[PDB]
Each structure stands twice: as structure tokens, then as C-alpha cells.
Ligand binder design. Structure first.
Ligand SMILES: CC(C)[C@H](NC(=O)[C@H](Cc1ccccc1)NC(=O)OCc1ccccc1)P(=O)(O)C[C@H](C(=O)O)c1cccc(NC(=N)N)c1
Ligand SMILES: [Zn+2]
Length: 304
């Protein structure tokens, strides 16, 4: 029951990860990097033409449960990759030279909850000692100035930073995977909505990354490219000053691991629909986003 221009439930996305892999074994392999709190499988698709010691770009979607256009984008990206390989020169070179590690849904338990109970759920669905309140904000759960700012220590809050960095099985799983593959991973891209922004470090502090000028120029070029298609306007800059300070984010953590190209994407829109982006905008949203992602990929490849 899968469609690329509709939002798909987890059962459908899971079946899709199996199907798309089965149908494109020369471009995709599927693994599970762990289980969620509620025992769902955290799938990771390695997209690329297999070969020895290839560099890689890591991209995840679905950190936050209600940001459905994020999940949709990872699925869209994988189809574009497999459909255009061999026909579009850039994507062909991309997949020949590197792998994309695509994690289509990180926070699966929360995503399921937005389908079954509460469309505006954000956090994970793990239990918390001493309270009935459920869930941790996965993007406050990383070891990046953990919980020192822009985060709550209260499990009942939407930005609960957890009992400790990587207290969540899902964030632990992602961090473990990236740690185990640091040599290969050259960029980290994490997909969110909404706001139409590209953000780079830092968010947990007002300090700037050493390659700040490069990141600004890269984000500037990526947003220009994105705008070429439908005129969609993005802003960009360091997380802390571009949107708000917040510790424990994965982009900041990834960067401090040594991944020099680390970006948070905030997709459409600017609040007219917010998280409830109509399915009628999935195609255009994903198409323009593809251009920005491919631009960044092309740049990273030329800087290996
Ligand atoms: C709509 C976007 C902006 C999302 N924000 C929300 O859902 C926030 C979450 C929240 C809840 C209670 C108290 C504070 C914050 N809620 C909300 O209504 O946001 C509205 C809004 C809309 C536009 C601009 C600013 C805010 P996000 O995708 O969760 C933003 C994300 C994050 O908060 O994890 C983010 C943005 C930019 C950089 C980073 N990276 C980082 N390391 N912090 C992380
Ligand atoms: Zn988000």
C-alpha cells in the first residue's frame, strides 16, 4: 500500500524497505542497527554501487514523530537514487564513488503513535521512572553539551533531554553506528520540519565551528539550488542563532565526532500547515530538497 506521494504508516514503510532492497540488490542493502523501545526494527539502507572502502554520507529522517514530511523524504530519496542511477550523470557518479547510509525512520515508536493516537506526538515512547509521562526528545538526547540549554529535565516536557545522553535505545543505536563507521562517514544530514532552513553547528553553544565560513557558503549555495525549482525560500546559518539554542542535538554531536559537514534540514513549510503538510506538497517538497541534498553531496565528493 506504499505510495511516494502519500504518508505511509510504519508497517508499510517497513515492508517498503524490504521490497525496495529486494528489487535493487545491486544498489541497496538493508540492515537493522538496533531495536526501538517498543521492539520495532531500526532499518538502515546502504544505497550505492558496492565496492571496497567507499566513503559515505549519513542521512536520517523521522527523529521527530510528527514531522511526517521528513519520513517521506528519505523514501523519495531512495527511489530517486535507484531510478536515475546510470541515467543521470551526477547520481551515477555519487553512487559509484560513495554510499548513502539512509535511516528512513529513527523514532519509529513515536511515528506509530502519531498514526494511532496523537498526530502531534514528538518524542520517543519510552517509559520514565517515577512518572506516568512518556518519552524523551531524541534531538536533546545526544552527548553535545547534553541538557545544558534549550532542554527540559522534566520527562513530561516535549524537550525532555532524557535520564542521560543516549539513554534512548534509538539514539544509542544511531550513535553506535556512526562511531563504528567514523572513518567512512564524511557528512551527516538530519531531516526535520518545518521552517525551511538549513542549519549547521553549533546549537548547544554560541561558539562557531572552525569551518564556519565554509559551512555558510555551502548552505548558501544549497538553498540557492533548492530555490531554482519552485521558488521556495530557505534561510540558513548556525543553529543557535538561526532558530534557537538547544543542547544534545545530533548534528552538533556528529560534528564534534569529526564529521565536518553536518546539517539539519527543516523542510516546508513556514507554519501555514506546519507539521500537517498536505500530501499534495510531498512531491514538490521532496524534489526541491533533492537538489539541495545532491548539491551538498557533490561538494563533499569534491572535498574528500
Ligand atoms: C518546527 C521545528 C522548528 C521543530 N521545533 C519544534 O517542534 C518545537 C519543539 C519545542 C517544544 C517545546 C519547547 C521548545 C521547542 N515546537 C514548536 O512548536 O516549534 C515551533 C517553531 C516553528 C518555527 C520556528 C521556531 C519554532 P524541530 O524540527 O524539532 C527543531 C529542531 C529541534 O528542536 O530539535 C532543531 C532545529 C535547528 C537545529 C537543531 N539542531 C540542534 N542541535 N539543536 C535542531
Ligand atoms: Zn524536528
Amino acid at each position: 500500500g506504499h505510495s511516494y506521494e502519500k504518508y505511509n504508516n510504519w508497517e508499510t514503510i517497513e515492508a517498503w524497505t524490504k521490497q525496495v532492497t529486494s528489487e535493487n540488490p545491486d544498489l541497496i542493502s538493508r540492515t537493522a542497527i538496533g531495536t526501538t523501545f517498543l521492539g520495532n526494527n531500526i532499518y538502515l539502507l546502504k544505497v550505492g554501487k558496492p565496492g571496497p572502502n567507499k566513503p559515505a554520507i549519513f542521512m536520517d529522517c523521522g527523529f521527530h514523530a510528527r514531522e511526517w514530511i521528513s519520513h517521506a523524504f528519505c523514501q523519495w530519496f531512495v527511489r530517486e537514487a535507484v531510478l536515475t542511477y546510470g541515467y543521470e550523470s551526477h547520481m551515477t557518479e555519487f553512487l559509484n564513488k560513495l554510499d548513502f547510509y539512509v535511516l528512513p525512520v529513527l523514532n519509529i515508536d513515536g511515528y506509530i503513535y502519531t498514526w494511532t493516537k496523537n498526530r502531534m506526538w514528538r518524542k520517543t515512547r519510552s517509559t520514565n521512572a517515577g512518572t506516568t509521562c512518556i518519552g524523551t526528545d531524541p534531538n536533546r538526547n545526544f552527548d553535545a553539551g547534553w541538557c545544558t540549554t534549550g532542554a527540559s529535565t522534566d520527562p513530561c516536557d516535549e524537550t525532555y533531554c532524557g535520564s542521560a545522553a543516549e539513554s534512548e535505545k534509538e539514539t544509542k543505536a544511531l550513535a553506535d553506528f556512526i562511531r563504528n563507521n567514523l572513518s567512512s562517514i564524511k557528512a551527516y544530514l538530519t531531516i526535520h520540519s518545518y521552517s525551511q532552513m538549513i542549519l549547521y553547528p553549533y546549537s548547544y553553544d554560541y561558539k562557531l565551528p572552525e569551518n564556519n565560513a565554509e559551512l555558510n557558503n555551502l548552505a548558501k549555495a544549497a538553498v540557492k539550488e533548492l530555490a531554482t525549482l519552485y521558488g521556495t525560500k530557505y534561510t540558513y546559518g548556525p543553529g543557535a542563532t538561526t532558530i534557537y539554542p538547544a543542547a544534545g542535538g545530533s548534528d552538533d554531536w556528529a560534528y564534534d565526532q569529526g564529521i565536518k559537514y553536518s546539517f539539519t534540514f527543516e523542510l516546508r513549510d513556514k507554519g501555514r500547515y506546519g507539521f500537517i503538510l498536505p500530501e499534495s506538497q510531498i512531491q514538490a517538497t521532496c524534489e526541491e530538497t533533492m537538489l539541495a541534498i545532491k548539491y551538498v553531496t557533490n561538494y563533499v565528493l569534491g572535498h574528500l
